[PDB]
Amino acid sequence: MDHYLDIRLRPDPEFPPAQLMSVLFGKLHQALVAQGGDRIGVSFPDLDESRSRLGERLRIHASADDLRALLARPWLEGLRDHLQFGEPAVVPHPTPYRQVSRVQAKSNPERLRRRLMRRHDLSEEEARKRIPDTVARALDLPFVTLRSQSTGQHFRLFIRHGPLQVTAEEGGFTCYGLSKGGFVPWF
């Protein structure tokens, strides 16, 4: 994956950039479940780790045929007025390589309590005795908010840009474009 395509959120008087970034990420995810495979990687070039902000840019990492297919496919319908685009081009080098991975946290003690009750046949009080409320961990990481279509929930999807490395390795990506082993050029 030596090719990239930058997408920057146009400023909108109607919307904040986080809402636009989340609906763009959901539509990219739906485009990848429509496409299939594990070869599509994402990034956030104007990231702010300190303020936990994604920035205002998103960058896809793939081959050029994937970029020209995704630049005209109807997952960009209704956002071309919200979005300005670049051109499908080759990445610069030398670049450090890092991973973009979805991090999940045990954020609700009661759901894991109900799982322990389902898998150990305990009552509610044994689940509260075995699992306290200190267990709940909150991440200090930026996030998109996503509407599931299988189930009906709205959940925060916390992303982590991994450590910078001098070389990249093989692997795939999930249907959200996040690394389950793959690496992306970071520039």
């Binding site: 400023p11 109607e14 007025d81 279509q149």
Partner: protein
């Protein structure tokens, strides 16, 4: 000396209605008179209000009517009669030089693209807006657009859009009663989330009678996104017409009074000291007079 008057009250022209949202199925949009409504239900997460399409419905029918009044310059309350005559002659000079032709084209564009669908548009794959001019109760002239072809940023001329602009121009000039019916269909998804207006259990959704809806002022704010004549930076599109034209969601105040491009100094220059601005800034102050409000000091 012709000082400005103490109170001015401009009635709201371009009066919209509450946008009732119902749902249904695509490819039968001409059968959309008995479609079931999108109700607001409670779902426990705390207690929030959320509203979705039914599990056999993939499009949203937002319906409202828009009444265009006309007589844009005439205030309904004013003290200084001399200021009233000067403002009347100023708006008369404006409409005599050029009628409501650019402003009606921009209002027709904001009706054409479904910008009154606020959040229900951005994930849509296809939007179709039907506008029926209703005189005497049945129909006078029917329209049908693709709201995704007409983007939100650009203003592009057309055959039917200029006809709609001529109708709204005839309305705003005081030369004919115009009542429109604006219906919009948007392919959102089967059972997806719609976004009605949000009422002040932290979250409550607006509904007139067991059926979700958008506020009338939200549709009125979406129709006023015609201002392209502010000092433009960052690649921002048209904003809603406002004195000190500001974006709360952006937190930025374009047309600040440090520059001479706000509504109030422009109006005082155009009426009192006879300093006519450019055609776009007088377009902007006539759009502010169409929007209405209370203007004047204590």
């Amino acid at each position: 000396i012709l000082s400005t008057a103490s109170v001015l009250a401009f009635e709201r022209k371009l009066d919209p209605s509450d946008a009732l949202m119902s749902a249904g199925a695509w490819a039968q949009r001409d059968a959309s008179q008995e479609w079931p409504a999108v109700t607001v239900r409670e779902k426990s997460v705390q207690t929030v209000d959320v509203a979705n399409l039914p599990s056999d419905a993939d499009t949203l029918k937002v319906r409202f009517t828009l009444r265009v009044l006309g007589g844009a310059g005439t205030p309904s309350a004013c003290n200084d009669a001399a200021y009233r005559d000067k403002l009347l002659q100023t708006v008369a000079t404006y409409v005599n030089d050029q009628g409501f032709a650019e402003l009606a084209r921009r209002y027709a564009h904001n009706l054409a693209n479904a910008r009154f669908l606020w959040r229900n548009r951005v994930g849509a794959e296809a939007v179709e807006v039907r506008i029926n001019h209703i005189r005497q109760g049945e129909v006078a002239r029917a329209w049908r657009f693709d709201a995704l072809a007409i983007g939100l940023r650009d203003f592009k001329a057309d055959a039917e859009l200029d006809a709609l602009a001529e109708l709204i121009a005839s309305g705003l000039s005081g030369s004919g009663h115009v009542l429109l019916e604006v219906v919009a269909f948007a392919r959102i998804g089967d059972g997806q989330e719609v976004f009605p207006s949000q009422e002040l259990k932290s979250k409550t959704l607006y509904s007139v009678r067991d059926a979700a809806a958008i506020h009338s002022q939200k549709i009125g704010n979406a129709l006023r996104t015609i201002d392209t004549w502010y000092p433009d930076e960052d690649g921002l599109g048209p904003i809603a017409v406002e004195p000190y034209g500001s974006v709360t969601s952006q937190g930025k105040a374009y047309r600040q009074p440090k520059q001479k491009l706000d509504f109030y100094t422009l109006l005082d220059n155009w009426v009192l000291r006879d300093e006519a601005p450019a055609v776009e800034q007088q377009h902007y102050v006539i759009a502010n007079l169409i929007r209405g409000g209370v203007f004047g000091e204590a």
